[PDB]
Amino acid sequence: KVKIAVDRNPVETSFEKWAKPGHFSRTLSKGPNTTTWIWNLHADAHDFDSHTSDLEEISRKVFSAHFGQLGIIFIWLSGMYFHGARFSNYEAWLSDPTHIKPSAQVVWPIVGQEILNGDVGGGFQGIQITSGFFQLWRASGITSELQLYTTAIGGLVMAAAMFFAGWFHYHKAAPKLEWFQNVESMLNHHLGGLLGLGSLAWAGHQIHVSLPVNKLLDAGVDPKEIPLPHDLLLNRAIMADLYPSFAKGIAPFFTLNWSEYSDFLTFKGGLNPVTGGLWLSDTAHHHVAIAVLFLVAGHMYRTNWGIGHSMKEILEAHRGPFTGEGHVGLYEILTTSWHAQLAINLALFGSLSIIVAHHMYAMPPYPYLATDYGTQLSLFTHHTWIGGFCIVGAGAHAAIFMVRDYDPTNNYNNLLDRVIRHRDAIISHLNWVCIFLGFHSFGLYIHNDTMSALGRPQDMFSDTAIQLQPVFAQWIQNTHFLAPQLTAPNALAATSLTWGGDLVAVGGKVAMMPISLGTSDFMVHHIHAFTIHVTVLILLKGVLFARSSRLIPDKANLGFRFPCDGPGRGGTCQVSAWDHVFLGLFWMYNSLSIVIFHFSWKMQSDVWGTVTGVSHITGGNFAQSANTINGWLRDFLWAQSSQVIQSYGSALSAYGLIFLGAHFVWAFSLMFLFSGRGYWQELIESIVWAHNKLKVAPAIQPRALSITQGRAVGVAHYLLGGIATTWSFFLARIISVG
Amino acid sequence: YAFQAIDFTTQAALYTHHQYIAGFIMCGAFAHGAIFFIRDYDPEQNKGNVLARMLDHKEALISHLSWVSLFLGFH
Amino acid sequence: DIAGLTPCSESKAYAKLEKKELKTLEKRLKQYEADSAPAVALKATMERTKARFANYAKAGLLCGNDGLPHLIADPGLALKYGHAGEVFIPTFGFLYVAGYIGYVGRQYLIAVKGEAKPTDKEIIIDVPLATKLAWQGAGWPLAAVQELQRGTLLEKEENITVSPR
Amino acid sequence: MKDFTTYLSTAPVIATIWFTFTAGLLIEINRYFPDPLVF
Amino acid sequence: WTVPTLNPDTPSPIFGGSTGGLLRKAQTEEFYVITWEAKKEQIFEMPTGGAAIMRQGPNLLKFGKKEQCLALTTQLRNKFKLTPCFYRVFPDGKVQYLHPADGVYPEKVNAGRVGANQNMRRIGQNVNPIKVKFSGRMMSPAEI
Amino acid sequence: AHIVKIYDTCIGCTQCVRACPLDVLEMVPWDGCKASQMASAPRTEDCVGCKRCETACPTDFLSVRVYLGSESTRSMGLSY
Amino acid sequence: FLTIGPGDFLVHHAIALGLHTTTLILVKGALDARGSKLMPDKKDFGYSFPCDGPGRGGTCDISAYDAFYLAVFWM
Amino acid sequence: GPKRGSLVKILRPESYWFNQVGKVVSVDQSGVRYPVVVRFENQNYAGVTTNNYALDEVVAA
Numbered sequence A: 001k002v003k004i005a006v007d008r009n010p011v012e013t014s015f016e017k018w019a020k021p022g023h024f025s026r027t028l029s030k031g032p033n034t035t036t037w038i039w040n041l042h043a044d045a046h047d048f049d050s051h052t053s054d055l056e057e058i059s060r061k062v063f064s065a066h067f068g069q070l071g072i073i074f075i076w077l078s079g080m081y082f083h084g085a086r087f088s089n090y091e092a093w094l095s096d097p098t099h100i101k102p103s104a105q106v107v108w109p110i111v112g113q114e115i116l117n118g119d120v121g122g123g124f125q126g127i128q129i130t131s132g133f134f135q136l137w138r139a140s141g142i143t144s145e146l147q148l149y150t151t152a153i154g155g156l157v158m159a160a161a162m163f164f165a166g167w168f169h170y171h172k173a174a175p176k177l178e179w180f181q182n183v184e185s186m187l188n189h190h191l192g193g194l195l196g197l198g199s200l201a202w203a204g205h206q207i208h209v210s211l212p213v214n215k216l217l218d219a220g221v222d223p224k225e226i227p228l229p230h231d232l233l234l235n236r237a238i239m240a241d242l243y244p245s246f247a248k249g250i251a252p253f254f255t256l257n258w259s260e261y262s263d264f265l266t267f268k269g270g271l272n273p274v275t276g277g278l279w280l281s282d283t284a285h286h287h288v289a290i291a292v293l294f295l296v297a298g299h300m301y302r303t304n305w306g307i308g309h310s311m312k313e314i315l316e317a318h319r320g321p322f323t324g325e326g327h328v329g330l331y332e333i334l335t336t337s338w339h340a341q342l343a344i345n346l347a348l349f350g351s352l353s354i355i356v357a358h359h360m361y362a363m364p365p366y367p368y369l370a371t372d373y374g375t376q377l378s379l380f381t382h383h384t385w386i387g388g389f390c391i392v393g394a395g396a397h398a399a400i401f402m403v404r405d406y407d408p409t410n411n412y413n414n415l416l417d418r419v420i421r422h423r424d425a426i427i428s429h430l431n432w433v434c435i436f437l438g439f440h441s442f443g444l445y446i447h448n449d450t451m452s453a454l455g456r457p458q459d460m461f462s463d464t465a466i467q468l469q470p471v472f473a474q475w476i477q478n479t480h481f482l483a484p485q486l487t488a489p490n491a492l493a494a495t496s497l498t499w500g501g502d503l504v505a506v507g508g509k510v511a512m513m514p515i516s517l518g519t520s521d522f523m524v525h526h527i528h529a530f531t532i533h534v535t536v537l538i539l540l541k542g543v544l545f546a547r548s549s550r551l552i553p554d555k556a557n558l559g560f561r562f563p564c565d566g567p568g569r570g571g572t573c574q575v576s577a578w579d580h581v582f583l584g585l586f587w588m589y590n591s592l593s594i595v596i597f598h599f600s601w602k603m604q605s606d607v608w609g610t611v612t613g614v615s616h617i618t619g620g621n622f623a624q625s626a627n628t629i630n631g632w633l634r635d636f637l638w639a640q641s642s643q644v645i646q647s648y649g650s651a652l653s654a655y656g657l658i659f660l661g662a663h664f665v666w667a668f669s670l671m672f673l674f675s676g677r678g679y680w681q682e683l684i685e686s687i688v689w690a691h692n693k694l695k696v697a698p699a700i701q702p703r704a705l706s707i708t709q710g711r712a713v714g715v716a717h718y719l720l721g722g723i724a725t726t727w728s729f730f731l732a733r734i735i736s737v738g
Numbered sequence B: 001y002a003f004q005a006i007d008f009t010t011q012a013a014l015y016t017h018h019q020y021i022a023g024f025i026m027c028g029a030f031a032h033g034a035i036f037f038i039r040d041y042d043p044e045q046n047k048g049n050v051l052a053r054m055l056d057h058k059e060a061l062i063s064h065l066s067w068v069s070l071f072l073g074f075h
Numbered sequence C: 001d002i003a004g005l006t007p008c009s010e011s012k013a014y015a016k017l018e019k020k021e022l023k024t025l026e027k028r029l030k031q032y033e034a035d036s037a038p039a040v041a042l043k044a045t046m047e048r049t050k051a052r053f054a055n056y057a058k059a060g061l062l063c064g065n066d067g068l069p070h071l072i073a074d075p076g077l078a079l080k081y082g083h084a085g086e087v088f089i090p091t092f093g094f095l096y097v098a099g100y101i102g103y104v105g106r107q108y109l110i111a112v113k114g115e116a117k118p119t120d121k122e123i124i125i126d127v128p129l130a131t132k133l134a135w136q137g138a139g140w141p142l143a144a145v146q147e148l149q150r151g152t153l154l155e156k157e158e159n160i161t162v163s164p165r
Numbered sequence D: 001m002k003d004f005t006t007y008l009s010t011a012p013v014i015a016t017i018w019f020t021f022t023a024g025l026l027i028e029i030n031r032y033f034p035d036p037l038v039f
Numbered sequence E: 001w002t003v004p005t006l007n008p009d010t011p012s013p014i015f016g017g018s019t020g021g022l023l024r025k026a027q028t029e030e031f032y033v034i035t036w037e038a039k040k041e042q043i044f045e046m047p048t049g050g051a052a053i054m055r056q057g058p059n060l061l062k063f064g065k066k067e068q069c070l071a072l073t074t075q076l077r078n079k080f081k082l083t084p085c086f087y088r089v090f091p092d093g094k095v096q097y098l099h100p101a102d103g104v105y106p107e108k109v110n111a112g113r114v115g116a117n118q119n120m121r122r123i124g125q126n127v128n129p130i131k132v133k134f135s136g137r138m139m140s141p142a143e144i
Numbered sequence F: 001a002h003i004v005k006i007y008d009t010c011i012g013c014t015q016c017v018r019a020c021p022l023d024v025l026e027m028v029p030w031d032g033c034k035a036s037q038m039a040s041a042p043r044t045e046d047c048v049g050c051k052r053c054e055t056a057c058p059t060d061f062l063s064v065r066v067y068l069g070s071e072s073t074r075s076m077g078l079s080y
Numbered sequence G: 001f002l003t004i005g006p007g008d009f010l011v012h013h014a015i016a017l018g019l020h021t022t023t024l025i026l027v028k029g030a031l032d033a034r035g036s037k038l039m040p041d042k043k044d045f046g047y048s049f050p051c052d053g054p055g056r057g058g059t060c061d062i063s064a065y066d067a068f069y070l071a072v073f074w075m
Numbered sequence H: 001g002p003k004r005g006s007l008v009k010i011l012r013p014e015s016y017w018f019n020q021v022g023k024v025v026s027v028d029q030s031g032v033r034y035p036v037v038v039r040f041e042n043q044n045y046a047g048v049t050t051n052n053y054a055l056d057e058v059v060a061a
């Protein structure tokens, strides 16, 4: 029986526990004796497993926490809309998108920082934004600042509702454990109601507001002169003036004569040629199809009536001869362990974000987006980074499950058990394939460097010497370009210009052209494969050996996060799964930095540029230069950092400052990464003596950071430094040459 | 030497060479001084002289080196 | 003057840099309307630029061969040639405020060590006692030299040391 | 209310209030007295 | 109490076979063999990875190092309240009993034990490294 | 083999014994402390030098000390 | 005797920073080689030992050799 | 030796609380080598606030 189950008034709303730091932990509620306490207080603040053993209380805590997160995000969205309405040039940009730079941040005139308010056009001065909100707002049909202001107030109201919902569902009416364990009902409601009704209501908004307003905006009529959306809902005769299908109403829908809705539910493909974005009619049909699909999908699992599937029965039904008991026991694991769920959801959520990056660069969904090169670079890079971080998190929480929640006396000869039982074979094969990939992928680059340096270019791996053509990718590309003719008859064009074909340009700039693939693309793709495989190796090794290894047979009893097991047995530093997350973080940074460099150079070289033929931003140097390390060093890094290094005295000077600052923070991380806390503790001893001499020794004893906190501080400053460096480089480059 | 300082690459190479040689040799001086303290220092054969009185005020030494390092770095 | 430096009111590269910055600001200015907000902002920027160059030439700063103000850090040379307001008066101003902060922190520590929970006062600040010591710390150099002369500024050799001292 | 002022007496809250006061005082000084290099 | 003997014909726990098992150290140098008597049939965690069903009665497992046998001993002793003992086996067939070599577990005092490696002084009363220079080898001053 | 020493500041709390993952230490009769128990290291040939014993000891300073000496196949923790 | 100015000022104070910091690490390695409060019997392990384990908060890079190691970066 | 509750001072040079002040808990009257039990208000690097000392390692100061 699926029903609402709630306990009344569990936790009194009181300011008492605000005044007692570390109340949540029996160890930390004793008070601070040394400085380590503070760090512990913040590190274990949200580790609810270390607070209680009771799954119900933990579940309630995570529920209200999620509400807090949603309220924060709503505050953030409210801020973006309010700043877009009050401190922007959005209307001016609407009147001239091709020659006005999107700006929605202005600085105050103090200490000379006023110079950052640059000439972005439209009679405005501010910081040019690259988040892409302007294109999203134009695509949604927003025309005035008033509507943005109203959206800001609405989002603030929703933030207040989310914080009230958090307080309410923790302190007043907090759900019971068997409410949270209704996973079949949760999937039904989220697949129907969330994704399904979400895309249904959005398709409603599109068909009724987006399509007419953007059709008029593409027609050329002044935005203020375009009818307001409520007049588009109210008087259907205007909707019939743009698309005569609307004259017949919803009569073709119920009578199944859906073909008459082909005015606004299309299958054109390609891009809008005057606008450089996907057709909103294609997007409307897409969201209608997505809606119907998800609402069908949301009626799959049995709840309070006989019909519907059961998750444990589907899992226990798939058993073979090679795997033994198969998927038995997995339902119990995924309905009692939050960390397993978090690992799965983080992996797929990160992967999904990377897919979002690729599909949004390749098939520009917003108008005047493809030619806002800064926005495209920013969006791709951003969502790729977010993706990578969520994948590393997935590996982390997988390992946390493996140490804290794994219990083999309910999990005995299972898929998980066999994985743990042949982990040596898995890791050794992954090891070998990583070394193989490293040798041949990186070795081609080193080979080319040597041959080019020795004056023998005919012996290189290139398009003119020893060729290594991406035959398979070229074949898939050609097939997808020829797809509208035979295997997709109702498609007018291909799904993306990059497959092949003509060229769509807007305002003299290239929106998208066919992307060619040669030896350089072969080499970078195998570099990507190598780095990804190594990252998977580290993380997977971390999760498979989290409990035990031949080195530490009882590693599980030492916890998930611990520094080592002493200098014996040769040395056991970084044996914990946490340390494997730490190394996977560095390798994830490596991989995604090479990925975004690939994207940046390739787009600036073979795609972007002006139309007179097409003059590219870097003239097409990718195909001959991206085969040597010196080529990346000179033609990419050195050449394209001109803009960042000479940005002083202009509006881009902040990117130079953050270039230097990011380099500094990156180097600053090396002190934590390369050293150890014994030295620092002894140094602190001397300093403590000096403070004792002058009666200024604190009652809370100064302690050097822990080993694991030294590693954490190290990797955090390392990531912040490197990522912010590439951020400043990218933004200054693409804003100046864009 | 004659027609040195008109060969500029020679100037840069010789200066950089002997400066890095000097840096490694100074770090080795302090390293073998620590090795002296660990292996060869007898405190009973040095009861009250200058070398034991350096170990007696070592916290003031390390504290004032810490102060000049922090001052020069911050400013 | 000092070290072969010309005064900034006499330096030519100083006036050249002033004219160059005004030229950059008016090249940014000449692409707007007359009474618009970017025009008002850039005219306020030009006003502050002219006022800043007039104030630096007024104060008797020394410029180099590039037209930039140079500072003199020697007490007697700056007191002799009238450059005391750039290092000497700033260094005694800094020593006043830095010793203020240090003396207020030291008095807070000695005030909270005499209780049953010194660490609990270190985490959660006694705000009335902190404000009382913050207002009383204006006579910190007098109280500092008085604690120096009584021998109560220093702890004796009851400090923590290592076995070879 | 006693516990709310005890929470406001904690270290990061007071550090936030005090650095907001100090930074705002420096910002108002650099506004009304633009660009001081000497004196 | 007398020193027990190894029965090689003791039934092993129910286990499908891991990749973390023995290596050539078992054939060339040594391998260690653990034995306990169980009260009921119950799943335990193998220290080399995976789950295993123990049999009701005597059990027998062989590991590669001593720490694996201590980890299984600690698991079977703190979680299941059992009394195991693990041996040392050479490829000749030589059997060396240990843990508990006294018969009583070392976490409680028993008469008859002789104290080994006990310095009867403080740690601050060690000599300086100048006093032990130029011996036959490296010496820490705590060796004397 | 590593060097493990026991010093007379031992208070026979048995913490070091229950911390060793290799069964090297044991408690012997003694008369130097109220607990009438002292640690002893009769099996230092199997010691790897992990120093869990030193972590478990409450006394200040340590009453058990591990001096990492010459490595063997047992002290390196090798299963191969 | 090259003509000098405020860049030469800033770089000579950066040089003083580097020298005093490297001297801090090297002198602190020479003097805390006999032992510190975190490790009073450091003379009993020698000059170059890995660590003393994760106990007492963790003791990584506690030997005088490790102070040399950390000071070569500053050199 | 010293009495319960009295303040003493530690002269063991390889101790964390050398040249510092603690409080006597008890003195064992047997032939134990380190009978003086002294608690300290601050903990060492191992988180311990109690140590045993000899008679010539404590001074009631």
Ligand code: CLA
Pocket (backbone or CB within 6 Å): A011, A012, A013, A014, A015, A016, A017, A018, A019, A024, A060, A061, A062, A064, A065, A067, A068, A072, A163, A164, A165, A166, A167, A170, A171
């Ligand atoms: C406004 C009235 C109010 C009051 C008096 C309380 C009081 C309490 N809550 Mg409740 N609760 C409330 C509203 C309130 N809550 C709201 C709005 C939510 C949804 C978030 C919750 C959800 C909730 C959960 C899940 C839990 C509590 C718990 C508690 C108890 C202890 C928590 C504590 O003392 O730390 C106080 C914490 C803070 C003062 C810090 C707030 C952190 C904010 C939310 C994060 C956002 C800051 C933001 C990111 C800015 C950062 C900028 C930059 C520097 C990064 C205490 C009785 C806990 C409990 O009962 O344990 C037994 C517990 O587990 N509350």
Ligand code: CLA
Pocket (backbone or CB within 6 Å): A075, A076, A077, A078, A079, A080, A082, A083, A087, A105, A106, A107, A108, D013, D016, D017, D020
């Ligand atoms: C959520 C993200 C977000 C971000 C990053 C920004 C960022 C900015 N805003 Mg925007 N804004 C936002 C959302 C955001 N805003 C929202 C949701 C609204 C509607 C309420 C606004 C309405 C708004 C206006 C009207 C203005 C800005 C302005 C600014 C700029 C300067 C802010 C400043 O100096 O304030 C002043 C600084 C302070 C008030 C510091 C005091 C902080 C206190 C002391 C902390 C105390 C700690 C306490 C426990 C926690 C806070 C509790 C809280 C209830 C007070 C800065 C770019 C200004 C601007 O753009 O100028 C051109 C401006 O005029 N914002």
Ligand code: CLA
Pocket (backbone or CB within 6 Å): A062, A063, A066, A067, A070, A179, A180, A182, A183, A185, A186, A189, A190, A192, A193, A194
């Ligand atoms: C069809 C109804 C429905 C909808 C739309 C949702 C939607 C959501 N649930 Mg789910 N939930 C449902 C039924 C539903 N739930 C049922 C029946 C159960 C019990 C089996 C759960 C148990 C559950 C748990 C344990 C959690 C969620 C969470 C979430 C949020 C995921 C965050 C996100 O990406 O959304 C995008 C964000 C939005 C779309 C914002 C709009 C949200 C508003 C409130 C509309 C959603 C409708 C809402 C359910 C109606 C509430 C009415 C209320 C006044 C009584 C999302 C808002 C997670 C969460 O974040 O909690 C805070 C979470 O931890 N749900």
Ligand code: CLA
Pocket (backbone or CB within 6 Å): A200, A201, A202, A203, A204, A205, A207, A208, A232, A233, A234, A235, A236, A239, A245, A246, A247, A248, A249, A250, A253, A261, A288
């Ligand atoms: C999912 C979101 C969504 C929403 C909200 C709408 C809404 C609408 N569509 Mg649209 N439509 C959609 C998706 C959506 N559509 C999609 C996906 C397609 C493609 C197939 C279309 C294709 C389409 C066409 C071709 C047309 C519409 C039309 C309409 C309008 C009239 C429909 C109607 O008569 O419904 C039936 C009436 C109701 C459902 C009434 C609602 C119930 C009321 C509010 C209850 C009130 C009760 C309360 C007690 C009384 C108030 C008391 C209070 C005052 C105190 C309406 C604004 C028509 C139009 O006007 O175009 C401009 C039209 O011609 N739609």
Ligand code: CLA
Pocket (backbone or CB within 6 Å): A431, A432, A434, A435, A436, A437, A438, A439, A442, A443, A446, A534, A537, A538, A583, A584, A586, A587
């Ligand atoms: C650029 C510096 C650098 C290099 C060369 C390496 C190299 C490697 N890392 Mg390392 N790593 C690095 C930075 C680097 N890493 C940093 C900064 C960290 C700290 C975050 C790590 C942390 C780390 C982790 C966690 C892991 C690695 C692993 C590896 C190995 C991957 C396997 C492989 O591809 O073999 C191929 C070898 C190469 C690509 C090296 C260059 C080979 C040249 C080009 C050809 C060799 C022929 C040569 C010229 C002949 C010389 C003859 C001469 C001697 C006479 C590889 C040796 C992984 C591993 O070992 O698992 C498989 C692993 O898991 N590293």
Ligand code: CLA
Pocket (backbone or CB within 6 Å): A664, A667, A668, A669, A670, A671, A672, A674, A675, A683, B066, B069, B070, B071, B072, B073, B074, G017, G021, G024, G025, G070, G071, G073
């Ligand atoms: C560029 C990288 C970098 C930087 C900045 C430092 C800086 C320092 N090192 Mg480190 N070191 C480094 C690399 C670096 N090191 C590397 C690669 C190693 C090899 C592992 C070491 C090994 C090492 C040793 C062995 C020692 C040092 C010491 C020091 C300190 C020397 C005294 C000083 O100059 O204080 C000036 C302070 C700075 C230059 C740091 C900047 C502080 C900023 C300006 C303050 C905060 C600003 C802002 C408000 C923060 C906002 C952040 C926001 C999130 C809140 C200084 C903090 C020594 C020490 O501790 O002496 C006391 C010491 O013994 N370092």
Ligand code: CLA
Pocket (backbone or CB within 6 Å): C074, C075, C076, C077, C080
């Ligand atoms: C940090 C170290 C330092 C250094 C290297 C200098 C360097 C100098 N001082 Mg300055 N000074 C300093 C700190 C320093 N000062 C401090 C802390 C004070 C306050 C006590 C002064 C107060 C002061 C006065 C009143 C005068 C100088 C003067 C000078 C210049 C020549 C002095 C000389 O020839 O004697 C050798 C240098 C030293 C012994 C270094 C210490 C300087 C002492 C404190 C003063 C020496 C003054 C000198 C006897 C008078 C020379 C008269 C001149 C006409 C020949 C020289 C550039 C003189 C000047 O203006 O020349 C143009 C001068 O009249 N200084």
Ligand SMILES: CC1=C(/C=C/C(C)=C/C=C/C(C)=C/C=C/C=C(C)/C=C/C=C(C)/C=C/C2=C(C)CCCC2(C)C)C(C)(C)CCC1
Pocket (backbone or CB within 6 Å): B029, B030, B032, B033, B034, B036, B037, G030
């Ligand atoms: C200017 C001039 C002058 C002067 C000069 C002088 C006076 C100089 C000085 C110089 C000096 C004054 C130098 C010194 C240096 C030093 C050093 C550089 C040191 C180092 C040290 C060390 C390295 C240590 C070591 C050790 C240890 C650690 C332990 C114990 C042992 C030993 C001791 C070995 C004249 C008059 C001629 C004339 C005019 C010009």
Ligand code: SF4
Pocket (backbone or CB within 6 Å): A563, A564, A565, A566, A567, A571, A572, A573, A574, A676, A707, G050, G051, G052, G053, G054, G058, G059, G060, G061
């Ligand atoms: S302390 Fe640092 S170094 Fe010594 S073992 Fe533990 S981790 Fe490795």
Ligand code: SF4
Pocket (backbone or CB within 6 Å): F009, F010, F011, F012, F013, F014, F015, F016, F017, F038, F039, F056, F057, F058, F059, F063, F064
């Ligand atoms: S060694 Fe440390 S722990 Fe083991 S008994 Fe003696 S005192 Fe108790």
Ligand code: SF4
Pocket (backbone or CB within 6 Å): A568, F004, F019, F020, F021, F022, F023, F024, F025, F046, F047, F048, F049, F050, F051, F052, F053, F054, F066
């Ligand atoms: S080091 Fe490892 S083995 Fe040697 S004693 Fe301490 S714990 Fe037992």
